[PDB]
Design a protein around this nucleic acid. Sequence first.
DNA 1: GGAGGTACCTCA
DNA 2: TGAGGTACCTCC
Lengths: 142, 142
Amino acid sequence: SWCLSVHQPWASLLVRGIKRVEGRSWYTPHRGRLWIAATAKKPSPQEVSELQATYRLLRGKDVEFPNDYPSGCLLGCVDLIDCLSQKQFKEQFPDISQESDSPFVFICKNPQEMVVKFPIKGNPKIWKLDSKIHQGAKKGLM
Amino acid sequence: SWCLSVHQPWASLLVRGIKRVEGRSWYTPHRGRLWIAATAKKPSPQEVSELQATYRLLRGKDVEFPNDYPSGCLLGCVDLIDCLSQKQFKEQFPDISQESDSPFVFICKNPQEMVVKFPIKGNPKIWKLDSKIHQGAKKGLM
DNA sequence: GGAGGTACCTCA
DNA sequence: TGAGGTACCTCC
């Protein structure tokens, strides 16, 4: 039921598995499925292309980006398998530890993207999806 | 017929005779009567009190400020008797030369403040008043 | 100028 | 967060 709002384009890169971690100033004990919502903040076409170029260098020339990075909607989910301090992140994930310098690093696995994305208004930190949109999101995930 | 738009509170201080010069980056050959209009930019009550404190120190304890500094209106007029370079300003007005460091300094005399001030939309530099507001302004000056 | 789009900032 | 007030910026 629990959701994290993330700015685009990083939001969609997370549910595509291209971005593998998300950094925050705070810790969460939450483990398991974590829904990902894009914030309302639209990214300029410039930062989308620059971030895409960067992730091409990190992941390979032919990585498949989403066609769009829609704002203000529920995108999909990840499994939040750990929430690591920066020190723990460097010890356990040396190959990607450069990808976040935040005090706490959310380690995400098993991303899933919704083919139909639903408009939504987010909140800070981990917040709870409303039942109706949560039910429709799980149905979409077939 | 010619007018200069000036930000408040400086605009009203000019037509009161409290501010004696106005600095600009450009020169004008205009001499004689120059109407003074306040721009639309409203001044914060903080810059009004700080500027009043400063001019109290420059002119004396009991100098009489206007009760209000209205924006976007025709305030009055001065006689523009010279337009001096900064070098000429220092040579000719050593007692007040510190009051403007602009490339050109408009030397104003015989200020008159209108009892009834008329709303107006200004322009850059010296611009020409419309004849209806000019006629009404001259009449107000009795 | 004056007008208004946009980025920035704050939020009993 | 999302919302919107405000300051800042540009202007065939």
